[PDB]
Symmetry: C3
Subunit: 136 residues, 3 copies
């Protein structure tokens, strides 16, 4: 694009989670996930179970383990720190979380995100990706 007939620098989102399918949901039937989510939420009412998987086609390192049991008051920012270290990202490498394809505030708590976004199996689902954008 160019217009004021100067060109725009066009920025475009790439390899967003969008409506990604989690391997966890493919691998385990609903009743098994729901029973597990119910039981871990009863066992630890002040913690939330979270599935973390990579956005398809994200140009980013693999995550060894996908199932997290997190204090409800833990911030997104603190969870970023732990996940970056599990992936062994360089400080200069981008990492963004998406819940339902929306990047959450770093000061949000995992409990706030869970209360708003947990699925019917009582898990919170987080996709991670790189910057997921180009054009500059």
């Amino acid at each position: 694009e160019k217009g004021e007939e100067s060109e725009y620098v066009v920025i475009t989102v790439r390899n967003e989670p969008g409506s990604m399918k989690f391997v966890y949901k493919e691998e385990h039937p609903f009743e098994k996930r729901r029973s597990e989510g119910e039981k871990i939420r009863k066992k630890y009412p002040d913690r939330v179970p979270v599935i973390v998987e990579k956005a398809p086609k994200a140009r980013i390192g693999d995550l060894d383990k996908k199932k997290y049991l997190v204090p409800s008051d833990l911030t997104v920012g603190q969870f970023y720190f732990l996940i970056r270290k599990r992936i062994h990202l360089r400080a200069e490498d981008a990492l963004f979380f998406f819940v339902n394809n929306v990047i959450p505030p770093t000061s949000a708590t995992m409990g706030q995100l869970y209360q708003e976004h947990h699925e019917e199996d009582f898990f919170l689902y987080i996709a991670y990706s790189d910057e997921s954008v180009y054009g500059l």
Copy 2:
């Protein structure tokens, strides 16, 4: 700077004029902003310029057409890499001299802060505080 006469550690922050507004009169900007917003309703036009005397690299271009859902944090990453910042180096946006949330979207900022020419105006800077 010393009742409780111990000295304070004093921090000091270090009026933005956009070259885009000096290059193009209001009527020309407004006509363009109107036209790009009609053509691409799920995109917003954004003027990005460097705070004067930020000791940070310049961008070649100031006019950006961005997805409404693009985050501040995503835009940060593209600029940091383009001007070769180290991970340790600071970069912030200022919209009406206020640093937005890194999770805020361009569409959210544009809805709240677009000027009457239908452009969102962003200044980028370093930490924009004096060294201690």
Copy 3:
């Protein structure tokens, strides 16, 4: 960590450590009435600045600050304050630094004036604890 009872893959269990939860040395060093007089005086002298006590969460694996009393612009963000502290205590980009107000991490884009308006104590000081990631997992 622990196997799920039903979906038997292990959880990575995340645990907080060395959170503020905490007694400020500034409140030990100066009685209430002395702190209040000082806070009153500095707020009258500099209406567009706020006085802030910054102290390290006990056992945080992070450098101490030489000084605890800060006089900051009301418009200064948490993020701008982080940049200056990282430089002071020689933190690498990959090293964590978080603030806690009343044991809650504030938005990085929050201003010190916003935090002060909401959280200043009755001595007219805003109290900030700083820590490392304050979490581990396995």
